[PDB]
Scaffold this active site. Structure first.
Site, PDB file in Angstrom:
ATOM      1  CB  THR D   1      -1.679  -0.325   1.505  1.00 24.55           C
ATOM      2  OG1 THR D   1      -2.582  -0.839   1.486  1.00 24.55           O
ATOM      3  CG2 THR D   1      -1.694   0.922   1.424  1.00 24.55           C
ATOM      4  CB  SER D   2       2.151   3.245  -1.810  1.00 24.04           C
ATOM      5  OG  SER D   2       2.758   2.613  -2.167  1.00 24.04           O
ATOM      6  CE  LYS D  33      -5.048   0.159  -1.469  1.00 23.58           C
ATOM      7  NZ  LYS D  33      -3.538  -0.020  -0.818  1.00 23.58           N
TER       8      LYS D  33
END
Ligand SMILES: O=C(C[C@H](C(=O)O)C1CCCCC1)Nc1ccc2ccc(-c3nc(-c4ccccc4)cs3)cc2n1
Ligand SMILES: [Cl-]
Ligand SMILES: [Cl-]
Ligand SMILES: [Mg+2]
Ligand SMILES: [Mg+2]
Ligand SMILES: [Mg+2]
Ligand SMILES: [Mg+2]
Lengths: 233, 125, 222, 196, 204, 211, 195, 226, 195, 196
Positions: D1-2, D33
């Site tokens: 995840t970024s 997200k």
């Protein structure tokens, strides 16, 4: 006994009417880090064989050198090295399979999964798999790692059994392979967009395609997806 | 705070009467008429929609209520008491039967459960 | 940690007739829940009228068969092209297996052929080399599904003659090759229904005094 | 995840990738997200999807009830509710959340809440497995009081690199802009950001 | 150790034409030691039959529990419970112990007294219903029973033919299981008559 | 598994069962648990089948070579010792073998117990395997030296039956042997299922079982 | 503890139980009576983990004695055995189960029949003509299978029991210090003082 | 197990295979993996079979009561929310992995939900051991603006991929179509591509083959009068 | 194996060793002689892990017999005990040590003195008036400490030994099936056939 | 550790930090991680100091003997000797080495040899625990055929960020320049690079 460090993901392949096709992406992963982006994992042996390798890259480079040395050694005191006594796909495979099983029997394996694709002297298609355990098998379609779970189902829709091989053309087979590589890029977290593809045909010989990209991707529908259930904005 | 009324509010009088039950029956008597008739191939239940005001939308007030797909109910007396009994009746049909046997309860047993709830309000603290 | 062993599934069946023998096995090769091949031959003609199948871990199975085929070749060289009898091959295989008592071939092996009196013979091995001659033996994944059925339909176990009520057993009459193949096909069709590792295809090798013949039958591919 | 959140002149922008993995398999390649807990208070989620969804749902409930009684809550108040859940249930949670919001009084604000349940107010924040690869880039390229267009480019370039090196990150780049003007959603596809 | 294979035992059920059959071995052991050759694993609550394999204490306990519940069901409903309804009761009762389960493999068999339709069902220890048309198996020789039933079974068998099929399925499955045998019983069930037969088998 | 062997007036009896198991699954109903080493020597089998077969067929090689070298038959004592010395080399390596070496030599009938630890015991009576406890009960209460060959054969047969009944990993059939000074004599394969019902009726035993 | 045997003959039930109690490497006692009278015609022997055995036995005894006083009536051996089974089946899923195996020997005065019940710590109940717990059965059941008849006298039952103990004394590695034998019949419970 | 969900023009469709397993053994060849939460809200479940059914019946029971309380037709977001909060609470110990779909007054919806409590949104989803084989098909053939007929085809093709290529999946294909403004149509055994071939022999025995010791009539009737 | 005792009196050494051999839960033999004659006036009893005991004892026996033939001379008990100790001290640091404890009873013909040596598997040697291995000493040493004199006759030594065995039989949990007793004196080695 | 090697127009430059740690204690704050195996073939070392020193010593021995027999070895040849040791002894080593050298024929070359013993020829390479934080920065800022001054600034800026975020990295920044002109050593102190 070891653990794999720098790794290569799926290798996929299939038979068609006049030969075989094999493909693999150009990535060398370091765990979750996509460390190396210019790695060739398809290695031609002569003009009739291509060995596709997944798993540990250091062990791949070792196998690459064994094969290069195999060609050198076959040419020794062999006037027919470029003719009747040239290396066959079946010779190259059995050699690797012997090495893989011997290494596992010493509890020091080459941490790889290998697919040998090629065309024999009599024009017969050759496609066989071997891995770190020395386990071997052959099928109209073959794939390693994630490719076994996602690519084989797609490739088996084209060639479900032996009798489907003569009915399958190189354009259809290549289309199926290229589609499978796109699906793996969508769904395999250790894959890359860039890949190599090789065709070994009994008439047109070995065609090696580099710097291929996954194209015609579907992403637009993502704009409409909001939240994880109840969110509207 | 705490509910400190842990004793019965319904008790026997010297004559053997249970006053609060009799008085509850008197409240039912003042209530709007409702009826039920059983046929060979069905049952019917009916009542009057006594609207409290013409500005009120009497469609939003349901005197006849579905308890299960094959069981219905109607009442006479205090509407709010009915509404909560229907809520409890619907729930007990699931908790004490459908979640156990995988099917809706028969009429007599659902009635038995509703009756139990009404009996407990006649003896509990 | 590195695990040198694996399970490629598969199921095999050997039945000995009066003057023939059969060795059958499905052609499906698997790992976990994936299919590797729908047709990967598992029963081999090893020469001298002997058929063989090493079921379990395919890498060890291919190695054992390869070594036994080699042992037949060297038996001819060393003993003036003498034919390797089925009992002699069985004893030889015991010694091949026990050479790895402490790092075993992870396979259950069966061979079939004819004895020196021309009668049908099947020999059955465990991974470490215990062996014995048998009439009927199912090996592999669905062995436990098939063997009880063979006890009932080949050796007529628990079957008595009507009217006597348990006093007189059903007589052990000999079976033909056509009758045996029916029991083999029904065994594998039933195994295919209830065992996920069994399916795709069935290959049977029949051994008589005339030689080794093959028969193939499709199985469900799900 | 970024994931990341960056304050600028007119407010704040949240950014994220869209990849969800179960090991090496991509369970969802178009994940959202960027989560809304209030009109102009959003969060970026990292860690356990189950934990972060459960938390954000509870927070949304708390701020809805807060609003009914006391009016619009501050971004600091939202971050406190997140913190209280993440800190008191730290033994049973794996949640890395960035909180971002816009007030008219306080303007754009960013709070990051890492694993332990601590709170840190910052000009900008980065989190998730892919954030490690862009600490150097983000530190060198971030400026205060950037324009909207500059800030969008900064997040686009940053997450582009995070995605490039992190296998756990990928897909599209989603962004949410929080200003006085309202709430704007943005999306950027692979063919756009990969060639940067 | 494994609670589902300490005591041993098997149960199998089959449908026929206007009939059902349910059968069990009679063994109870402590691993290798045979303790009882009279441990019947089939019980009945009215016209509904229940076979239970697995841990013997739980078998005994569950019988006593379903006797309890069906006796109350009857007092309230004023009628005997049907197989479809009982199957849901078994599933409900097992799942209520989801995280501390009874180590059993129950099998329901019976004929609906109103529709006359034959019924069988199987469960895992946690309540998952397997409503099969053909047959249900349970026990330490379930793999063996699956092989026998899948090959011997054919639909619409008559009571006296079904008896032979289920008896041979059980007997030959049990003779390939160390933890099953020591006797066997078969129930043949019709809408208003039930016959119980003890089989003769090897006692080793 | 249940095996036994005992010495008596007229030689030594050897009786074994025939079951082999893979967990709860009975992998074999009829395995031979007696190995014919030579015409005057027998060996029982308990533990790993492979180990018992390999090492005892190898003992036969060595007992045959003895005869060629010395022109005389090897003693039971010496044969048992050769076997125990093989076990002693793979000491700790994981072999599983329990056997009784039965024979007749110059000293009369002979019986030695040998196991994977290298243990070697002389005795009149032995029993090994998962069912040995059941067999010992029948043997201890009925054994005499004054036994006739007929009664002795029945004792060893009845003793295996006792174990086959109670022990789940013992059963199938009974294999009988009688060792004389003129060699060993095989006394057949007896199905336990049929034998059980027969013994129950004729003996009156197993009253608890219904037949 | 170690050894407990039971045999039901024509007109009585005979229970034999070992006398030894061991702490560490030392035998503390060689005259321990591993049994409790639950009612005038019902006897329970027991074996299992230290402490749990007596506590459980005395708890059962108290409950049956309480029942006897309340109803002025003796429960049947079957009823007592079911009560005991339920308590053990209840116990096995408790926080700390009672690790106790029992034999219940009783004479039913209503049916005029002796009855022997074997129950293990899991709550596994079986009615038997003869029974045992632990390994005791491994040595003795072959003798009982051979010699047992249902029409045996009490004296014949004792002789068959002596043979079982002799076999145990020969083939068991542990010294259990002999057994106390008790007989349960129509006249009640009595101990055989010479065995 | 292979289950899928596909959105289309005016609704949503889900599908599943029909094999239930206990390790390598097939327990039931025609299992029903499609469950009804409410009339127009159906879910498909993978993982622990008892858990998917139990959690589905419980939420369906509470959804029914909610629908009666509110005088409204149940929403998919309600079933979703009630499921995830129940599953989250048991921290993955209830092994239920579901695909939830349906239509309600708000429109057509498609969600997935994992055992630990995480939910996802999508136009096409797949779960189970055959999810990769199914997703490969969905990623190859899915497009925006599908018709009802195109979606049923895509869904059943995705299930077939799992049936043929995944050993944990097999037998038949079940489908349920939920279209807006219509009754939901449950198509049990929509496809039947795995029928067993005829056996070579009949194994029906002669009567009297089995040895019997005792026979007796079982009294199943109650205590009789007189 | 289990039990081995030794006592050195005025003019002899007496060794007592148990007769039992156990495999699994079954006693295979109750007449096993856990001893080897190393030379005409030197006896060694042994106890330890199965197999290792006899193999070690016979290996020592072969070496001492080889020495006797080579030199036409009997080694002193002290010399033999030192040889044995060295072999065990050598063994303890091997790949797989020999898990064997021994008592060496000998009569020195040169000094006209009986001698008893106790050696454990580590190679720990001690000369003693009386000794034991394992748990045997825990039960018996208090009796030996009390009753032992160095001027005891062989008959008195046997009586004190009987008392030790009786105490073992009373307080040990294991049945060791009695003992074989052997006496080593100037005339050589003999077995007491009634004990 | 933070190490890198970058090719440019006139040759190649190696760069490294100077921190050696035993847990959180800094055992040496002025370490020289730039190691010479031949006149114009150097290496950057990461991992076990014992392993990487032992390897570089053996390699230096092999190339000294090579030179005595066959003349000046190629950078590729040096990388092969490193690889052979790292690959064949992978079970007992923890070494991450970057090899860099200058020929007149081949000019500047860079080879990286990670944990497994694989070899990868690259335009530039980064390694060590601190490299993770500068993947994004280095990818965005690297160009081919840079000048010496540009390349020095690139390494200085890159390692500055690696040091900033990685606790295992720090101290001074050492650099070694490999060109036709010769061998130049550079050093940059905290007060210089921290303010970048
Ligand atoms: O000895 C034992 C098992 C032990 C026992 O019962 O005491 C058990 C104790 C409890 C733990 C499990 C082991 N089994 C024996 C004994 C003698 C045996 C003699 C021959 C054979 C042969 N088995 C095949 C064969 C089998 C299966 C497949 C192929 C070949 C051939 S010969 C197997 C034998 N198995
Ligand atoms: Cl999410
Ligand atoms: Cl250093
Ligand atoms: Mg048995
Ligand atoms: Mg499948
Ligand atoms: Mg000592
Ligand atoms: Mg630092």
């Amino acid at each position: 006994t070891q653990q794999p460090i720098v790794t290569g993901t799926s290798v996929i392949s299939m038979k068609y009417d006049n030969g075989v096709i094999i493909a693999a992406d150009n990535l060398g992963s370091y765990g979750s880090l996509l460390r190396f982006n210019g790695v060739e994992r398809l290695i031609p042996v002569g003009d009739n064989t291509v060995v596709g390798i997944s798993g540990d890259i250091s062990d791949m480079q070792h196998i690459e050198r064994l094969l290069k040395d195999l060609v050198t050694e076959n040419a020794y005191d062999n006037p027919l090295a470029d003719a009747e006594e040239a290396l066959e796909p079946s010779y190259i495979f059995e050699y690797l399979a012997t090495v893989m099983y011997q290494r596992r029997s010493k509890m020091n394996p080459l941490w790889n999964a290998i697919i040998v694709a090629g065309v024999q002297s009599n024009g017969d298609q050759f496609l066989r798999y071997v891995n770190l355990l020395g386990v071997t098998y052959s099928s109209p379609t073959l794939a390693t790692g994630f490719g076994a779970h996602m690519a084989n189902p797609l490739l088996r829709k084209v060639v479900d059994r032996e009798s489907d091989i003569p009915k399958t053309t190189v354009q259809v087979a290549e289309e199926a392979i290229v589609n499978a590589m796109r699906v793996l890029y969508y769904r395999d977290a250790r894959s890359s967009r860039n890949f190599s593809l090789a065709i070994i045909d009994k008439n047109t010989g070995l065609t090696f395609k580099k710097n291929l990209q996954v194209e015609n991707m579907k992403w637009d529908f993502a704009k409409d997806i909001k939240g994880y259930g109840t969110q509207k904005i | 705070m705490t509910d400190r009324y842990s004793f019965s509010l319904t008790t026997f009088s010297p004559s053997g009467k249970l006053g609060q039950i009799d008085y509850a029956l008197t409240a039912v008597k003042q209530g709007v008429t409702s009826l039920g008739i059983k046929a060979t191939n069905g049952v019917v239940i009916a009542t009057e929609k006594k609207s409290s005001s013409p500005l009120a939308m009497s469609e939003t007030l349901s005197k006849v209520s579905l308890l299960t797909p094959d069981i219905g109910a109607v009442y006479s007396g205090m509407g709010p008491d009915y509404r909560v009994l229907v809520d409890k009746s619907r729930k007990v049909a699931h908790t004490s039967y459908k979640r156990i046997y995988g099917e809706y309860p028969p009429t007599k047993l659902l009635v038995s459960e509703v009756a139990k709830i009404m009996q407990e309000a006649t003896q509990s603290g | 940690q590195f695990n040198p062993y694996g399970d490629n599934g598969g199921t095999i069946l050997g039945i000995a007739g009066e003057d023939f023998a059969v060795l059958a096995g499905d052609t499906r090769n698997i790992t976990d829940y994936s299919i590797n091949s729908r047709y990967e031959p598992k029963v081999f003609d090893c020469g001298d009228n002997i058929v063989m199948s090493a079921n379990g871990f395919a890498a060890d199975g291919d190695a054992l068969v390869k070594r036994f085929k080699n042992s037949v070749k060297w038996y001819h060289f060393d003993h003036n092209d003498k034919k390797l009898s089925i009992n002699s091959a069985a004893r030889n295989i015991q010694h091949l297996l026990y050479s790895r008592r402490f790092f075993p071939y992870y396979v259950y092996n069966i061979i079939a052929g004819l004895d020196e009196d021309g009668k049908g013979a099947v020999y059955s091995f465990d991974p470490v080399g215990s062996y014995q001659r048998e009439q009927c033996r199912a090996g592999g994944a669905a062995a436990s599904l098939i063997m009880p059925f063979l006890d009932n339909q080949v050796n007529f176990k628990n079957q008595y003659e009507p009217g006597t009520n348990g006093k007189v057993k059903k007589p052990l009459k000999y079976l033909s090759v056509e009758e045996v193949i029916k029991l083999v096909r029904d065994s594998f069709t039933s195994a295919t229904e209830r065992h996920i590792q069994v399916g795709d295809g069935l290959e049977i090798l029949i051994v008589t005094k005339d030689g080794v013949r093959k028969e193939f039958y499709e199985l469900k591919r799900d | 995840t970024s994931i990341m959140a960056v304050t600028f002149k007119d407010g704040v922008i949240l950014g994220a990738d869209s990849r969800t993995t179960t090991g090496a398999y991509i369970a969802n390649r178009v994940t959202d997200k960027l989560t809304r807990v209030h009109d102009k208070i959003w969060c970026c989620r990292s860690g356990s999807a189950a934990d972060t969804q459960a938390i954000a749902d509870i927070v949304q409930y708390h701020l809805e009830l807060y609003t009914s009684q006391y009016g619009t809550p501050s971004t600091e108040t939202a971050a406190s509710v997140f913190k209280e859940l993440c800190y008191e249930n730290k033994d049973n949670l794996t949640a890395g959340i960035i909180v971002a919001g816009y007030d008219d009084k306080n303007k754009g604000e960013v709070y990051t809440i890492p694993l332990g349940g601590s709170v840190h107010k910052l000009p900008y924040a980065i989190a998730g497995s892919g954030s490690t690869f862009i600490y150097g880039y983000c530190d060198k390229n971030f400026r205060e009081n950037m324009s909207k267009e500059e800030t969008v480019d900064f997040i686009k370039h940053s997450l582009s690199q995070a995605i490039k090196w992190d296998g756990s990150s990928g897909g599209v780049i989603r962004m949410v802009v929080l200003t006085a003007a309202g709430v704007e959603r943005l999306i950027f596809y692979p063919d756009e950001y990969e060639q940067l | 150790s494994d609670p589902s294979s300490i005591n041993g035992g098997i149960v199998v059920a089959m449908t026929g034409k206007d009939c059902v059959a349910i059968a069990c071995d009679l063994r109870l052991g402590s691993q290798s030691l045979g303790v009882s050759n009279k441990f019947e694993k089939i019980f009945h609550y009215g016209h509904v039959f229940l076979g239970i394999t697995g841990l013997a204490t739980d078998v005994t306990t569950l019988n006593e529990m379903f006797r309890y519940k069906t006796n109350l069901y009857k007092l309230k409903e004023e009628r005997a419970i049907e197989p479809e309804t009982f199957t849901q009761l078994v599933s409900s009762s097992l799942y209520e112990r989801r995280f501390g389960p009874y180590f059993v493999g129950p099998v329901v068999a019976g004929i609906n007294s109103k529709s006359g339709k034959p019924f069988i069902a199987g469960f895992d220890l946690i309540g998952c219903i397997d409503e099969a048309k053909d047959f249900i198996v349970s026990g330490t020789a379930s793999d063996q029973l699956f092989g026998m039933c899948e090959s011997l079974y054919e639909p619409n068998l008559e009571p006296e033919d079904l008896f032979e099929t289920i008896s041979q399925a059980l007997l030959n499955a049990a003779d390939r299981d160390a933890l099953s045998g020591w006797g066997a019983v078969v129930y043949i069930i019709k809408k208003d008559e039930v016959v119980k037969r003890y089989l003769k088998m090897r006692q080793d | 598994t249940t095996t036994l062997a005992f010495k008596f007036q007229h030689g030594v009896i050897a009786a074994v069962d025939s079951r082999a198991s893979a967990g709860s699954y009975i992998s074999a109903l009829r395995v031979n648990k007696v190995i014919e080493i030579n015409p005057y020597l027998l060996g029982t089998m308990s533990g790993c089948a492979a180990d018992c077969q390999y090492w005892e067929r190898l003992l036969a090689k060595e007992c045959r070579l003895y005869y060629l070298r010395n022109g005389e038959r090897i003693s039971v004592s010496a044969a048992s010792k050769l076997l125990s010395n093989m076990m002693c080399q793979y000491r700790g390596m994981g072999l599983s073998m329990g056997s009784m070496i039965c024979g007749w030599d110059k000293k009369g009938p002979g019986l030695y117990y040998v196991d994977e630890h290298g243990t070697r015991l002389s005795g009149n009576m032995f029993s090994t395997g998962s069912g040995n406890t059941y067999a010992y009960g029948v043997l201890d209460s009925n054994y005499k030296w004054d036994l006739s060959v007929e009664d002795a054969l029945y004792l060893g047969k009845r003793s295996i039956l006792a174990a086959a009944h109670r022990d789940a990993y013992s059963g199938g059939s009974v294999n009988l042997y009688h060792v004389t000074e003129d060699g060993w004599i095989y006394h057949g394969n007896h199905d336990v299922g049929e034998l059980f019902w027969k013994v129950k009726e004729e003996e009156g035993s197993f009253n608890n079982v219904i037949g | 503890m170690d050894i407990i045997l039971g045999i039901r003959v024509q007109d009585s039930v005979i229970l034999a139980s070992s006398k030894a109690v061991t702490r560490g490497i030392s035998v503390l006692k060689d005259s321990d009576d591993k049994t409790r009278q639950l009612s005038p015609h019902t006897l329970m022997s027991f074996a299992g983990e230290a402490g749990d055995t007596v506590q459980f036995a005395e708890y059962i005894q108290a409950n049956i004695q309480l029942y006897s006083i309340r109803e002025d009536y003796e429960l049947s051996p079957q009823a007592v055995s079911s009560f005991v089974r339920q308590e053990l089946a209840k116990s096995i899923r408790s926080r700390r189960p009672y690790q106790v195996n029992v034999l219940i020997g009783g004479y039913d005065k209503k049916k005029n029949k002796p009855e022997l019940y074997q129950i293990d710590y899991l709550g596994t109940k079986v009615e038997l003509p003869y029974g045992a717990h632990g390994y005791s059965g491994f040595y003795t059941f072959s003798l009982l299978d051979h010699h047992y008849r249902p029409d045996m006298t009490t004296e014949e039952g004792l002789d068959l029991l002596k043979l079982c103990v002799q076999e145990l004394e020969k083939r068991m590695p542990m010294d259990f210090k002999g057994v106390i034998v008790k007989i349960v019949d129509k006249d009640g419970i009595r101990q055989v003082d010479d065995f | 197990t292979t289950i899928v969900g596909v959105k289309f023009n005016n609704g949503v469709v889900i599908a599943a295979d029909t094999r239930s397993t206990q390790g390598p053994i097939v327990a039931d060849k025609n299992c029903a993996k499609l469950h009804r939460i409410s009339p127009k809200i159906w879910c498909a479940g993978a993982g622990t079979a008892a858990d998917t059914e139990a959690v589905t019946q419980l939420i369906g029971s509470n959804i029914e009561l909610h629908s009666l309380y509110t005088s409204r037709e149940p929403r998919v977001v309600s079933a979703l929310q009630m499921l995830k909060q129940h599953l989250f609470k048991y921290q993955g110990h209830i092994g239920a992995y579901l695909i939830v779909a349906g239509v309600d007054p708000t429109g057509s919806h498609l969600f997935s939900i994992h055992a630990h409590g995480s939910t996802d949104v999508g136009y096409y989803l797949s779960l189970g051991s055959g999810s990769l084989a199914a997703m490969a098909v969905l990623e190859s053939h899915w497009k925006q603006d599908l018709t009802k007929e195109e979606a049923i085809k895509l869904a059943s093709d995705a299930i077939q991929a799992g049936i043929w290529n995944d050993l944990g999946s097999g037998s038949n294909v079940d489908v349920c179509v939920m279209e807006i403004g219509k009754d939901a149509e449950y198509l049990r055994n929509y496809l039947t591509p795995n029928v067993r071939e005829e056996k070579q022999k009949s194994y029906k025995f002669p009567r009297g083959t089995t040895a019997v010791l005792k026979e007796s009539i079982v009294n199943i009737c109650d205590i009789q009068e007189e």
